């Protein structure tokens, strides 16, 4: 068993998009996660992946909804940052 990171395996385009791939052996732009909203969404993902299977449908719905709300709040936070830096 060997890692696909070790092997020079190209990325394949599936239902999950490849996106703008980054060149090998080059500077990939480090994106720093420092907004409390961004830690909110990451922590929500971690807690969901840890808790796992909840029997109650409404509980599943609520954990998924808090994930979506964290993503949303991050989205308006980034949009506000963009507007601030674009006009002011």
């Amino acid at each position: 068993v060997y890692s696909e990171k070790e092997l020079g395996i190209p990325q394949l385009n599936t239902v999950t998009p490849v996106g703008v791939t980054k060149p090998k052996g080059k500077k990939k732009g480090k994106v720093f996660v420092d907004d409390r909203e961004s830690m909110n969404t990451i922590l929500a993902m971690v807690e969901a992946e840890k808790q796992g299977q909840i029997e109650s449908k409404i509980m599943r719905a609520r954990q998924l909804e808090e994930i979506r709300e964290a993503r949303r709040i991050e989205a308006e936070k980034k949009e506000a940052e963009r507007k601030a830096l674009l006009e002011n």
Partner: protein, 76 residues
């Protein structure tokens, strides 16, 4: 959650009271400063907010089970 069956269901069913505990802790002050406290075999349908808060605090501070497991920080 103090029903025996739900008591045993607890962890397997992922039943947590933390939100209610925090709500009680954050609402004690309004319950202190509101006027209608004493304008009033049943376990829920009690007409007085004073006895309602008494049941709340008995449940939290002295739950009928695992009396020697209550978090000291919550206690204090």
């Amino acid at each position: 959650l103090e029903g025996q069956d739900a008591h045993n269901a607890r962890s397997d069913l992922h039943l947590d009271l933390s939100f209610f505990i925090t709500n009680l802790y954050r609402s004690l002050l309004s319950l202190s400063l509101n006027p209608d406290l004493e304008l009033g075999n049943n376990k829920i349908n009690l007409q007085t907010t004073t006895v309602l808060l008494l049941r709340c605090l008995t449940s939290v501070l002295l739950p009928p089970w695992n009396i020697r497991s209550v978090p000291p920080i919550r206690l204090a």
